Amino acid sequence: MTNNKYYTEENKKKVWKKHMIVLKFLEQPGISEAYLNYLQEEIHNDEWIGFENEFFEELTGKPVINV
Amino acid sequence: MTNNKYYTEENKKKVWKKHMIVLKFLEQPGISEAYLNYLQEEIHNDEWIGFENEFFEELTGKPVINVG
Ligand code: NI
Ligand code: NI
């Protein structure tokens, strides 16, 4: 069974760093409130499956990572 | 700038999912533009030293990840 195309070490590193970039953006004024309102809207979208812990941590201001 | 002590598989999976959540937020009206503005203000900030490639891929709309 071929090795992963998507969830790869290089790609996990790239997402880690790009997530740092976006995270500083989310803390900007105006943007913060909109991210929050978006998160409140999205937890009720059943398009996401298996994402419950992450939505909660995001909604409650929990640290991104543990540690 | 990090020793990668918390760069663990569990945390990588967590950051993966969260970044998917945020990615859908960026596609909303207004937010993509605001994000590009932010990145433009941000390019010459020595806050992102060592982030150059990621920053550039983000600014030029290059894919989030590399399929191959
Ligand atoms: Ni609901
Ligand atoms: Ni510069």
Author numbering:
A (entry chain C): 1 to 67
B (entry chain A): 1 to 68
From the paper:
AimX also inhibits the function of phi3T_93, a protein that promotes lysogeny by binding to MazE and releasing MazF. In all structures, phi3T_93 shows an identical all-helices fold composed of a longer N-terminal helix (α1), followed by two shorter helices (α2 and α3) connected by a long unstructured loop forming a V-like shape. The α1 helices of two phi3T_93 monomers interact, resulting in a W-shaped tight and globular dimer that displays two shallow grooves, one across each side of the dimer molecule.
We obtained the structure of phi3T_93 alone (wt and its N-terminal His-tagged version; His-phi3T_93) and in complex with AimX. Size exclusion chromatography coupled to multi-angle light scattering (SEC–MALS) analysis confirmed the phi3T_93 dimeric organization in solution. We hypothesize that phi3T_93 promotes lysogeny by binding AimX and MazE, reducing the amount of antitoxins that can block MazF activity.
